[PDB]
């Protein structure tokens, strides 16, 4: 319930399509916006692991298609720095469908998941499938 949310490395601008890797029924997300982004002239909003991202579904169940939803981007392809003296980065670009309050709408995520959202929203800690 604390928002000590730690530095993040910036990547995945608006207009990127990424994998879903969950049983929500979606296949690929399409980033349309991220929250917490302020006002810069030509800056494209881009995703952070601990930030919700407004996204659409391009392939998947018609139930969750044709509309905007919130997704937690879990696995990045850019090295994010940490006080541990060592960045972290992945190959799959992935995000999990969540409700605006924060909790995950799916049941399990196939690949590794981000631990920061587990304590940002307490209902993701219980459902964390296989954290790196």
């Amino acid at each position: 319930t604390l928002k000590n949310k730690m530095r993040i490395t910036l990547s995945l601008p608006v207009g990127a399509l990424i994998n879903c890797c969950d049983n929500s029924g979606g296949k690929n997300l399409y980033i349309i916006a991220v929250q917490g982004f302020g006002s810069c002239l030509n800056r494209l909003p881009a995703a952070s692991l601990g930030d919700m991202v407004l996204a659409t579904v391009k392939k998947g169940k018609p139930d969750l298609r044709k509309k905007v939803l919130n997704a937690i981007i879990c696995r990045q392809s850019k090295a994010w720095r940490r006080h541990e003296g060592y960045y972290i980065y992945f190959e799959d670009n992935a995000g999990v469908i969540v409700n605006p309050k924060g909790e995950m709408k799916g049941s399990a995520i196939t690949g590794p998941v981000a631990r920061e959202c587990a304590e940002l929203w307490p209902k993701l800690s219980s459902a964390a499938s296989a954290i790196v």
Partner: protein
């Protein structure tokens, strides 16, 4: 008419004009103030560019998300070839600024310091400071009595010794360092002892205090607007090139404003970095100052593989947070902070965990020569 999308301007007007600095050393506009209650001691220092490196630590800030967990930080270690104190200068306040009452030199002076007063030393008769160091002490006593009666700001001419450093330069850099503290009556006796000897940094520099760094940034010659102020590149379709500001002002006023970014010199500017807290005190000859009792390996301030464009370091070291400006072999100036604070990190006591020894040039593999030799052993 108005802009449809208002956005912040480019660059800061507070660093104008973006022109080449007149000198190489870092001048000081302002020294930290003085108080009657506080005791008379030193007020600044100087040295060179030893390193702006990392160190591993552990935060003690309550409620921090890292806190107990080990962290990595960024601090600096200073190069201090001891400065020789050679001169004393008195200043008195007047409605026209603080004016020099007089300066007094040490009865014996170094050759490196005197070499600075020349442009062709190899061809001169080295006659500077020859017959000016044979004055009676009655004049000195009278003038220091005058200093006590009239002067209110006391500064010490100190000069570095580049012979210790691997620099090609043989002239000594000369500056003046303020002395801050109590009243004149105590100050007179407190400034009667150190008038000739060289300067050890650990004399006043203490852990858990804030300092500032003064230097001259690197140089790049003339550069375009896109580099000097980071203006937006024009679209590729632009006729007479794209690396320029499109509109340099409206029709009226019928002149180019001074706020318009233009091409010119970037770099070789005067820079001061504030809020740089000092953390630890060490030496040059000793063998375990940088390392800790939890590290139990062998190493001193010594680097590995040489320093790229800096040679080797054979002088003192301390610890202080941050990174520095300038280039290699560039003189750096160290000031104390102006107004000390009582905030949590302002009074925070600190302690390190591990100290780097590695090949600071790029991606190396061995932190120490002993490790490199041992890990292979029998070879060609």
């Amino acid at each position: 008419s108005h802009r449809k999308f208002e956005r912040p301007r480019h660059g800061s007007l507070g660093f104008l004009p973006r022109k080449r600095c007149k000198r190489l050393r870092g001048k000081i506009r302002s020294f930290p103030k003085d108080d009657k209650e506080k005791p008379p001691h030193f007020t600044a220092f100087m040295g060179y560019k030893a390193g702006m490196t990392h160190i591993v630590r552990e935060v003690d800030k309550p409620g921090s998300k890292l806190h107990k967990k080990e962290i990595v930080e960024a601090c600096t270690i200073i190069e201090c070839a001891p400065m020789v104190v050679v001169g004393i200068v008195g200043y008195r306040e007047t409605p026209k600024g603080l004016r020099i009452l007089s300066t007094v030199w040490a009865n014996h002076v170094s050759d490196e310091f005197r070499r600075r007063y020349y442009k062709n030393w190899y061809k001169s008769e080295k006659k500077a400071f020859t017959k000016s160091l044979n004055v009676p002490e009655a004049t000195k006593n009278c003038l220091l009595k005058r200093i006590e009666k009239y002067c209110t700001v006391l500064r010490a001419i100190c000069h570095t010794q580049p012979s210790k450093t691997p620099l090609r330069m043989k002239k000594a850099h000369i500056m003046e360092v303020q002395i801050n503290g109590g009243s004149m009556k105590e100050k007179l006796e407190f400034v009667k002892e150190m008038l000739e000897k060289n300067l050890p940094v650990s004399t006043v520099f203490n852990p858990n205090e804030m300092i500032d760094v003064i230097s001259v940034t690197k140089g790049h010659g003339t550069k375009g607007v896109v580099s000097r102020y980071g203006v937006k590149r024009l679209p590729r379709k632009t006729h007479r090139g794209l690396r320029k500001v499109a509109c340099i002002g409206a029709w009226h006023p019928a002149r180019v404003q001074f706020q318009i970014p233009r091409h010119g010199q970037k770099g070789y500017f005067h820079r001061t970095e504030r809020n740089k807290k000092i953390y630890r005190i060490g030496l040059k000859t000793d063998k375990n100052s940088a390392s800790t009792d939890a590290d139990i390996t062998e190493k001193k301030i010594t680097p590995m593989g040489g320093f790229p464009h800096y040679g080797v370091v054979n002088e003192d070291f301390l610890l202080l947070k941050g990174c520095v400006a300038g280039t290699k072999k560039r003189p750096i100036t160290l000031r104390k902070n102006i107004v000390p604070q009582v905030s949590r990190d302002a009074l925070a006591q600190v302690s390190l965990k591990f100290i780097d020894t590695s090949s600071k040039i790029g991606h190396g593999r061995f932190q120490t020569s002993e490790e490199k030799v041992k890990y292979y052993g029998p070879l060609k």
